[PDB]
């Protein structure tokens, strides 16, 4: 169904959000960082807000951003000790998510090679930078999901 599928996506996102919240807790319990990277962000032009809403361009953006987050999600593996099953679950449930959004759609991936070296570049940095990268992934992937969640609720 349409209501079934839409509930099922709503639910999958909420589960990822809970997870992110766990990693958040664990990380700024070390960094206190909760108040360059070019991380995927929603802008009014993407069609996802209530002023300027557009199903088709919103949905393309959701799926493109999520696909861009993936390498940042890979970065996240083994930077967590008490909340690692979740670190893994977040990575894996994003994939399931992207798969649900694709069945929903009609009509652009990232290159693995940039991603292989962007990833060694982030992993190469000092411990403060490493944690600063983490807090920003978590923060921006979260805002991204929330924005995706509100819009899907209106599609």
């Amino acid at each position: 169904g349409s209501l079934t599928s839409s509930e099922r996506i709503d639910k999958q996102i909420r589960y990822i959000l809970d997870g992110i919240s766990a990693l958040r807790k664990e990380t700024c319990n070390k960094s206190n960082m909760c108040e360059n990277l070019n991380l995927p962000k929603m802008a009014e032009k993407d069609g996802c807000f209530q002023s300027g809403f557009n199903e088709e361009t919103c949905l393309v953006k959701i799926i493109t951003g999520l696909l861009e987050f993936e390498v940042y999600l890979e970065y996240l593996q083994n930077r967590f000790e008490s909340s690692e099953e979740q670190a893994r679950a977040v990575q894996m449930s994003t994939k399931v998510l992207i798969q649900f959004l694709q069945k929903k759609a009609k009509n652009t991936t990232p290159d693995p090679t940039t991603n292989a070296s962007l990833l060694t570049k982030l992993q190469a940095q000092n411990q403060w930078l490493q944690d600063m990268t983490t807090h920003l992934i978590l923060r921006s992937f979260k805002e991204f999901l929330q924005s995706s969640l509100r819009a899907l609720r209106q599609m």
């Binding site: 169904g1 209501l3 079934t4 639910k11 894996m92 798969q99």
Partner: protein, 258 residues
């Protein structure tokens, strides 16, 4: 007025918005009530749906949220076809909630503080083509739990704490095409468990800590090798090797017994 018919505060706002009314004190016609066939009220603050029984033609229902416990009034919506039910805090399904809802095609039941499914609970739902019991925290399934569900084509049991499966659990599901068991605690499955699933197109087994000690792993290991196409990863792609042994991290299907 609406607030009289639907005594719950949030449920009255749902209906008000559903009908394009200006306040919860507006009167409603027999026409307005007769013609609601879809109610969308997941992640709401509803505690009770009392009043819903005055809405005989609801076919599509999404219902759920932190505060919900009182769903007794669902029982006589004999037209309900698509139901998504998410009572976050609920601990016990009312005796035979689903018994009179025999036109149900699609049932999503996400009730994570429930922990045990009462036996018989799905026995009247013979028209179900799709059952989703993800996100509960199920340690086990009761015997015979899916037996009357002859028509299921999609069954999703992922994100639970299943440690084992009942012998024969899927034996009556010959139309099943899609079966999800990922993100549980399966150490193993019983010999034969998939043998009757001759329509299976997609199965997901990854993110279980499988026990690969021989001879126990035999059946599963050989099963995965002999349906290398059905076995899928989180991105929906073919990945026989996604099923992995705990500790070691080897592919289950890389284990060969004497």
């Amino acid at each position: 007025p609406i607030k009289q018919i639907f005594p719950d505060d949030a449920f009255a706002e749902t209906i008000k918005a559903n009908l394009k009314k200006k306040s919860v004190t507006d009167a409603v016609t027999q026409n307005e009530l007769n013609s609601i066939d879809q109610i969308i009220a997941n992640n709401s603050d509803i505690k009770s749906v009392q009043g819903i029984q005055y809405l005989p033609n609801v076919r599509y229902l999404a219902l759920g949220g932190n505060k919900l416990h009182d769903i007794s009034a669902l029982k006589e919506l004999t037209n309900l076809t698509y139901l998504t039910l998410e009572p976050n805090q609920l601990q016990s399904l009312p005796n035979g909630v689903f018994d009179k809802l025999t036109n149900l095609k699609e049932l999503q039941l996400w009730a994570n503080q429930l922990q045990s499914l009462p036996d018989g609970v799905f026995d009247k739902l013979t028209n179900l083509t799709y059952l989703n019991l993800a996100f509960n925290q199920l340690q086990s399934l009761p015997k015979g739990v899916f037996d009357k569900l002859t028509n299921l084509t999609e069954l999703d049991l992922s994100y639970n704490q299943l440690q084992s499966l009942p012998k024969g659990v899927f034996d009556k599901l010959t139309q099943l095409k899609d079966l999800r068991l990922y993100q549980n605690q399966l150490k193993s499955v019983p010999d034969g468990v998939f043998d009757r699933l001759t329509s299976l197109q997609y199965i997901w087994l990854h993110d279980n800590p499988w026990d690969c000690t021989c001879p126990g792993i035999r059946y599963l290991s050989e099963w995965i090798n002999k349906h290398s196409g059905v076995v899928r990863n989180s991105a929906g792609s073919v990945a026989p090797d996604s099923a992995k042994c705990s500790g070691s991290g080897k592919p289950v299907r890389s284990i060969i017994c004497p």
